Amino acid sequence: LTASMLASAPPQEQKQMLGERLFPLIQAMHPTLAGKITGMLLEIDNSELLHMLESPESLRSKVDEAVAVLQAHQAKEAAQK
Amino acid sequence: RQLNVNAKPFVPN
Ligand SMILES: [Zn+2]
Protein backbone atom coordinates (compact mmCIF):
# COMPACT_ATOMS: atom_id res chain seq x y z
CA LEU A 1 0.00 0.00 0.00
CA THR A 2 1.36 3.42 -1.05
CA ALA A 3 0.22 6.96 -0.26
CA SER A 4 -0.45 7.33 -3.99
CA MET A 5 -2.96 4.50 -4.03
CA LEU A 6 -4.69 6.29 -1.16
CA ALA A 7 -5.12 9.70 -2.79
CA SER A 8 -6.48 7.86 -5.84
CA ALA A 9 -9.57 6.77 -3.88
CA PRO A 10 -12.20 8.80 -1.98
CA PRO A 11 -12.45 9.13 1.85
CA GLN A 12 -14.88 6.36 2.80
CA GLU A 13 -12.99 3.91 0.57
CA GLN A 14 -9.55 4.98 1.85
CA LYS A 15 -10.35 3.54 5.27
CA GLN A 16 -11.50 0.30 3.65
CA MET A 17 -8.17 0.16 1.80
CA LEU A 18 -6.25 0.81 5.02
CA GLY A 19 -8.33 -1.56 7.11
CA GLU A 20 -7.41 -4.44 4.81
CA ARG A 21 -3.72 -3.89 5.56
CA LEU A 22 -4.31 -3.31 9.27
CA PHE A 23 -6.71 -6.12 10.03
CA PRO A 24 -4.32 -9.11 9.69
CA LEU A 25 -1.85 -7.49 12.06
CA ILE A 26 -4.39 -6.43 14.70
CA GLN A 27 -6.01 -9.84 14.34
CA ALA A 28 -2.80 -11.67 15.21
CA MET A 29 -2.82 -9.77 18.50
CA HIS A 30 -6.56 -10.13 19.23
CA PRO A 31 -8.37 -12.74 17.07
CA THR A 32 -11.79 -12.01 18.52
CA LEU A 33 -11.77 -8.24 19.11
CA ALA A 34 -9.95 -7.63 15.81
CA GLY A 35 -12.93 -6.29 13.84
CA LYS A 36 -13.85 -3.72 16.49
CA ILE A 37 -10.32 -2.52 17.29
CA THR A 38 -9.63 -2.06 13.61
CA GLY A 39 -12.87 -0.08 13.28
CA MET A 40 -11.87 2.14 16.20
CA LEU A 41 -8.43 2.84 14.75
CA LEU A 42 -9.72 3.67 11.28
CA GLU A 43 -10.95 7.02 12.55
CA ILE A 44 -7.38 8.24 12.89
CA ASP A 45 -5.15 10.24 10.51
CA ASN A 46 -4.33 8.06 7.54
CA SER A 47 -0.85 9.60 7.66
CA GLU A 48 -0.50 8.17 11.17
CA LEU A 49 -2.37 4.99 10.22
CA LEU A 50 0.25 4.70 7.47
CA HIS A 51 2.88 5.17 10.13
CA MET A 52 1.51 2.41 12.30
CA LEU A 53 1.46 0.07 9.32
CA GLU A 54 5.21 0.59 9.26
CA SER A 55 5.78 0.67 13.00
CA PRO A 56 4.70 -2.43 14.98
CA GLU A 57 5.50 -0.93 18.39
CA SER A 58 3.26 1.99 17.35
CA LEU A 59 0.50 -0.28 16.10
CA ARG A 60 0.70 -2.43 19.21
CA SER A 61 0.76 0.60 21.46
CA LYS A 62 -2.39 1.93 19.80
CA VAL A 63 -4.04 -1.50 19.92
CA ASP A 64 -3.47 -1.94 23.66
CA GLU A 65 -4.89 1.54 24.17
CA ALA A 66 -8.03 0.65 22.23
CA VAL A 67 -8.30 -2.59 24.19
CA ALA A 68 -8.19 -0.80 27.51
CA VAL A 69 -10.85 1.82 26.71
CA LEU A 70 -13.03 -0.74 25.01
CA GLN A 71 -13.11 -2.87 28.17
CA ALA A 72 -13.45 0.01 30.61
CA HIS A 73 -16.41 1.25 28.64
CA GLN A 74 -18.18 -2.08 28.39
CA ALA A 75 -17.50 -2.77 32.06
CA LYS A 76 -19.07 0.62 32.78
CA GLU A 77 -22.24 -0.22 30.84
CA ALA A 78 -22.30 -3.41 32.92
CA ALA A 79 -22.20 -2.08 36.48
CA GLN A 80 -24.91 0.51 35.89
CA LYS A 81 -26.63 -0.40 32.60
CA ARG B 1 -4.92 10.09 21.35
CA GLN B 2 -8.72 9.77 21.67
CA LEU B 3 -10.71 6.70 20.60
CA ASN B 4 -14.37 6.05 19.88
CA VAL B 5 -15.66 2.84 21.46
CA ASN B 6 -18.76 3.07 19.27
CA ALA B 7 -16.86 2.97 15.99
CA LYS B 8 -18.34 0.52 13.47
CA PRO B 9 -16.36 -2.76 13.35
CA PHE B 10 -14.28 -3.30 10.20
CA VAL B 11 -14.77 -6.41 8.03
CA PRO B 12 -12.08 -8.00 5.80
CA ASN B 13 -12.36 -8.54 2.03
ZN1 LIG C 1 -18.15 4.76 27.53
Author numbering:
A (entry chain A): 545 to 625
B (entry chain B): 67 to 79
Text from the published report:
Cytoplasmic poly(A)-binding protein (PABP), also termed PABPC or PABPC1, is an essential protein that binds to and mediates the stimulatory effect of the poly(A) tail on translation initiation. Previous studies showed that MLLE is a peptide-binding domain that specifically recognizes a conserved PAM2 (for PABP-interacting motif 2) sequence. Unlike other PAM2-containing proteins, eRF3 possesses two overlapping PAM2 sequences (PAM2-N and PAM2-C), which each independently bind to the MLLE domain of PABPC1 with low micromolar affinity. Here, we determined two crystal structures of the MLLE domain of human PABPC1 in complex with the PAM2-N and PAM2-C peptides from human eRF3.
We obtained well-diffracting co-crystals with eRF3 residues 67–81 (PAM2-N) and 76–90 (PAM2-C). Overlay of the MLLE/PAM2-N and MLLE/PAM2-C structures reveals striking similarity of the bound conformations despite the highly divergent peptide sequences. In both structures, the peptide binds by wrapping around the highly conserved KITGMLLE signature motif of MLLE and interacting with the hydrophobic pockets between helices α2 and α3 and between helices α3 and α5 of MLLE. The peptides adopt an extended conformation interrupted by a β-turn at residues Asn70-Val71-Asn72 in PAM2-N and at residues Asn79-Val80-His81 in PAM2-C. In the N-terminal part of the peptide, the side chain of eRF3 Leu69 of PAM2-N inserts into a hydrophobic pocket formed by the side chains of Met584, Ile588, Ala610 and the aliphatic parts of Lys606 and Glu609. Another hydrophobic interaction involves the invariantly conserved alanine at residue 73 of PAM2-N and at 82 of PAM2-C. At the C-terminus of both peptides, Phe76/Phe85 fits into the shallow cavity formed by Gly563, the methyl groups of Thr582 and Leu586 and the aliphatic part of Glu564. In addition to its essential side chain, the amide of Phe76/Phe85 hydrogen bonds with the carbonyl of Gly579. The simultaneous requirement for Phe76 for MLLE binding by both PAM2-N and PAM2-C explains the previous observations of a one-to-one stoichiometry of eRF3 binding to PABPC1 despite the existence of two PAM2 motifs.
